[PDB]
Design a protein around this ligand. Structure first.
Ligand SMILES: CC(=O)N[C@@H]1[C@@H](O)[C@H](O[C@@H]2O[C@H](CO)[C@H](O)[C@H](O)[C@H]2O)[C@@H](CO)O[C@H]1O
Ligand code: NA
Ligand code: NI
Length: 150
């Protein structure tokens, strides 16, 4: 499953913005390992069409764990600097002060996300995955490694 994983970024400064080195075709994996700090309110993993900041680049897949109250994961898409319809997942595996491994698997019609070896959620494509060339990681999170399996 991770036998083809190639980690290429270690302990990046957050915020991290980096070009994805290949097209996110079906079967592609994005693997992100790190920690949630004790004071974390939220962090996000954004799969972006480009790295523009002004105006803000479209986010095909916003994967946004939030830790207040019982915690959740918000997923959404940003187009023309505007958010679409939120898909909220309340069964979240993330915890402050806990390590994690996020595996984002890119499928034909959706993303399938597993955390710590366990399925977490699905997100149907709203932007064609071929337009995704940039990985952004923002917020209160510590990242040990970013890798890809194409
Ligand atoms: C229950 C609900 O709809 N809450 C919404 C927030 O999640 C949302 O925050 C926004 O949610 C976005 C994803 O949907 C991003 O995470 C962004 O950082 C964050 O500010 C705001 C602004 O769109 O609207 C509230 O009504
Ligand atoms: Na945001
Ligand atoms: Ni550590």
């Amino acid at each position: 499953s991770l036998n083809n994983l190639q980690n290429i970024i270690y302990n990046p400064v957050i915020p991290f913005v980096g070009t994805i080195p290949d097209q996110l075709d079906p079967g592609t994996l994005i693997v992100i390992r790190g920690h949630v700090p004790s004071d974390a309110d939220r962090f996000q993993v954004d799969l972006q069409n480009g790295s523009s900041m002004k105006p803000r680049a479209d986010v095909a897949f916003h994967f946004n764990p939030r830790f207040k109250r019982a915690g959740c994961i918000v997923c959404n898409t940003l187009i023309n600097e505007k958010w679409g319809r939120e898909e909220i997942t309340y069964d979240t595996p993330f915890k402050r002060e806990k390590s994690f491994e996020i595996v984002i698997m890119v499928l034909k019609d959706k993303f399938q996300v597993a955390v710590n070896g366990k399925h977490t959620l699905l997100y149907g494509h709203r932007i064609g995955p071929e337009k995704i060339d940039t990985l952004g990681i923002y917020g209160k999170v510590n990242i040990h490694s970013i890798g890809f399996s194409f």
